Amino acid sequence: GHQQLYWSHPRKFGQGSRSCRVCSNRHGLIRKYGLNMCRQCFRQYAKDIGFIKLD
Amino acid sequence: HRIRITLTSRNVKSLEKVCADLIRGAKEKNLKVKGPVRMPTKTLRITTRKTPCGEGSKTWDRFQMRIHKRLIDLHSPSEIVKQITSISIEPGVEVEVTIA
Amino acid sequence: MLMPKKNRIAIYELLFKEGVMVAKKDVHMPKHPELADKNVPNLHVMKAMQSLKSRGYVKEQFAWRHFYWYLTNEGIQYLRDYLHLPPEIVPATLRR
Amino acid sequence: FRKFTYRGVDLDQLLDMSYEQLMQLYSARQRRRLSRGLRRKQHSLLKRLRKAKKEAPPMEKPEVVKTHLRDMIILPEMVGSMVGVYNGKTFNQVEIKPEMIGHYLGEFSITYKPV
Amino acid sequence: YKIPDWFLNRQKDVKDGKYSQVLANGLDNKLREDLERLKKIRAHRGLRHFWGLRVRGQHTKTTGRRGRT
Amino acid sequence: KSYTTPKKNKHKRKKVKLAVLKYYKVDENGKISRLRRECPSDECGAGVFMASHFDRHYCGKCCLTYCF
Amino acid sequence: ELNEFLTRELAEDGYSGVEVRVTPTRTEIIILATRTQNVLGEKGRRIRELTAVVQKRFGFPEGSVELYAEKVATRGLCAIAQAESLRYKLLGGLAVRRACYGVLRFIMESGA
RNA sequence: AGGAGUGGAGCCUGCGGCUUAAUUUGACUCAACACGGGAAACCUCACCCGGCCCGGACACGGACAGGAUUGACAGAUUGAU
RNA sequence: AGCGUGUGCCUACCCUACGCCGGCAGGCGCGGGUAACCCGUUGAACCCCAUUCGUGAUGGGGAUCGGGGAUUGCAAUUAUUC
Ligand SMILES: [Zn+2]
Numbered sequence: 001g002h003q004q005l006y007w008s009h010p011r012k013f014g015q016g017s018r019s020c021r022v023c024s025n026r027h028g029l030i031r032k033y034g035l036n037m038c039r040q041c042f043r044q045y046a047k048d049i050g051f052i053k054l055d
Numbered sequence: 056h057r058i059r060i061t062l063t064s065r066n067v068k069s070l071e072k073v074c075a076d077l078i079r080g081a082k083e084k085n086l087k088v089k090g091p092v093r094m095p096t097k098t099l100r101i102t103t104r105k106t107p108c109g110e111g112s113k114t115w116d117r118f119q120m121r122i123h124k125r126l127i128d129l130h131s132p133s134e135i136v137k138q139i140t141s142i143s144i145e146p147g148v149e150v151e152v153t154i155a
Numbered sequence: 156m157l158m159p160k161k162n163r164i165a166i167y168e169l170l171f172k173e174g175v176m177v178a179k180k181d182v183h184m185p186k187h188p189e190l191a192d193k194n195v196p197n198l199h200v201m202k203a204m205q206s207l208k209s210r211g212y213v214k215e216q217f218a219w220r221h222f223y224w225y226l227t228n229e230g231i232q233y234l235r236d237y238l239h240l241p242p243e244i245v246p247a248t249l250r251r
Numbered sequence: 252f253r254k255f256t257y258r259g260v261d262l263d264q265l266l267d268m269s270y271e272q273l274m275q276l277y278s279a280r281q282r283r284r285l286s287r288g289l290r291r292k293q294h295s296l297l298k299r300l301r302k303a304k305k306e307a308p309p310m311e312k313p314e315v316v317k318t319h320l321r322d323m324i325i326l327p328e329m330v331g332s333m334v335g336v337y338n339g340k341t342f343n344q345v346e347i348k349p350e351m352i353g354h355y356l357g358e359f360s361i362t363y364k365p366v
Numbered sequence: 367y368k369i370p371d372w373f374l375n376r377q378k379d380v381k382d383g384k385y386s387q388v389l390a391n392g393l394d395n396k397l398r399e400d401l402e403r404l405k406k407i408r409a410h411r412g413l414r415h416f417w418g419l420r421v422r423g424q425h426t427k428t429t430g431r432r433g434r435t
Numbered sequence: 436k437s438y439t440t441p442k443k444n445k446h447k448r449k450k451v452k453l454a455v456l457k458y459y460k461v462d463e464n465g466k467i468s469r470l471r472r473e474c475p476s477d478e479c480g481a482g483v484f485m486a487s488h489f490d491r492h493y494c495g496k497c498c499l500t501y502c503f
Numbered sequence: 504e505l506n507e508f509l510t511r512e513l514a515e516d517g518y519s520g521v522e523v524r525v526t527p528t529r530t531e532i533i534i535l536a537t538r539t540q541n542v543l544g545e546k547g548r549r550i551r552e553l554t555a556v557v558q559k560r561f562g563f564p565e566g567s568v569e570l571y572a573e574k575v576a577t578r579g580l581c582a583i584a585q586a587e588s589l590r591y592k593l594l595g596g597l598a599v600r601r602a603c604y605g606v607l608r609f610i611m612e613s614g615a
Numbered sequence: 616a617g618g619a620g621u622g623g624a625g626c627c628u629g630c631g632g633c634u635u636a637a638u639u640u641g642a643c644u645c646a647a648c649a650c651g652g653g654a655a656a657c658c659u660c661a662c663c664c665g666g667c668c669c670g671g672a673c674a675c676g677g678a679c680a681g682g683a684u685u686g687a688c689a690g691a692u693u694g695a696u
Numbered sequence: 697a698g699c700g701u702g703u704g705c706c707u708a709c710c711c712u713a714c715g716c717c718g719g720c721a722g723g724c725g726c727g728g729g730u731a732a733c734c735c736g737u738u739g740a741a742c743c744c745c746a747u748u749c750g751u752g753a754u755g756g757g758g759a760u761c762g763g764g765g766a767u768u769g770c771a772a773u774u775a776u777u778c
Binding site: 208210 | 672
């Protein structure tokens, strides 16, 4: 039954296919340069990745 | 016997220090060495939003990441280049050796 | 929990040679990447591990998807009682 | 009063003719519904509705079939049946005929009322 | 006179399916019989054409103020 | 909690006492007499018994419907 | 990710900070702490346990990572370790005034 | 003093209002009204119509191998082989 | 003209040059690039010249509708886009 009803929607594309690397949420996602991050956790974890603000 | 070493780093002053170290080493090794080739740099422009909510002024920010890649050209045999590659390392750069 | 007899044997023998395990939190994931020899979902894996920590034999903390399960010494004694090996053996993280 | 034509062919000409030229017979949008490949991924709904349609009824109104699925094309062998389209809440019992062949089943609806 | 077949105002007609240029009164006849056919099949597009609504998918929540009253 | 709609039952295994003598027919002489068939494939052996319907038949796990 | 792991896991030991090293075939990372007897457990149990954690979580070869324990003097500089130490001094329960004035006296005696 | 414009016209989009199965909401001057990075066909979804799996860990005490779950191929039903 | 972007971790969704079918959205083989090299010397629009223009809601303006054809995805009907 549920062994053949878990996978009715193969997560290949769409919004539910991709998610953030932090909180498993799907809003404000950064996919440029492969961060897979939401914006707020990117802000509070921006300093320790080797980024400093210049301009 | 053309061998090339590409030098990239997060920072710029440590990159120039390491590049000066390898240029001075190839100079005291008494061989034919090309000077430090100055490749153009790339700038990572990232723009996010300040407000976690949608309240207040629409104040964006600008995030900059500076990548600095360089290369030098050597005319030394392979084992000497491997030894000077394996010596004088730092946790800011990556070593990378091409034989061509 | 509904899971086969060989599955808990594989889980406990992986716990013996590897005293800690990691698992990514997902329900639509029929294959465990580190346990490649047998097809197993990680769902029953952390079901068994939350059973162990809730009855108080393994420690528990959470990180981002990945739990980290540090076996206590009495939990290792209970598991070696369950698999009935003598306690002369050690997990592979104890040899120096 | 007069026998209708469907871009050249008639009712029995639609009835006896199969898919590989029926696709050219209707529009190119409905070609994409069947031209992608094999229809045996999760087509238990499709197969059971085709068998229930192929079940021959006695001399009365045919047996009613209703589904929550919406994605169908009005097919020439599909007409002559009583179907209830899943109009949001309750299966809206509609009457069909071999005239809107080449269109979709969800295009017979009104939501609540005009305001 | 050797025109391409796609360069015609209506294709795959109800009457024969032959692609041809349709005259002005012919175009009015074709439009009125098409609206009558959609009304007779009581379709959603015919219903929105009866009510003066939108079929091509645009929002009249903010526009179309020059309709009723 | 509960709605106005009644709950749906499920096929539970009813408690039947001493059904093992329903496997073979216990005769006088020491030879086993069986009223059931088996699954002739090698995936399931003769130790696995089958589903006793009246006209059709069922294998162990192969789902091979054996009919006449 | 590893830094947030370390401040999540080393929450009773005074974790200061780390800096990774980019080196081929020996991916070494160095961990700064305050109590080096409580980072190892029973003669290096916890250190090799964390080594096994990072190996099986981040996909590393057999024995590639090595965890190095080091100490730093003048504790008043590291503010996140100081915040975790004042967390240590108020985890059970105290008045904020007396313990806050005590840690103010300590960080002004340190030479700030 | 001056340039470009909105408010006039058509289109795009957000909110208020009426509303229905609901058209889920937070935000009403600067400091909301192309905002939550939100350009909603599936997911989004937290709104409505319709049911399966346990993700009741664990503990107490009753069932328990002489058997306790779960997984099922003709055919009526449904939304499913 | 210039700041840019690039083969993906579960990742298939990258930029596409070149040769045929076709009026076209597009279809098939064909090479390169982990990147000042390959797109690309980014042959961009706005401009400049020569025709059709000439004040009539006109050749301005493209909102109004249906038909036909490609592509995306498991599927676009209440048009996905073109
Ligand atoms: Zn069998």
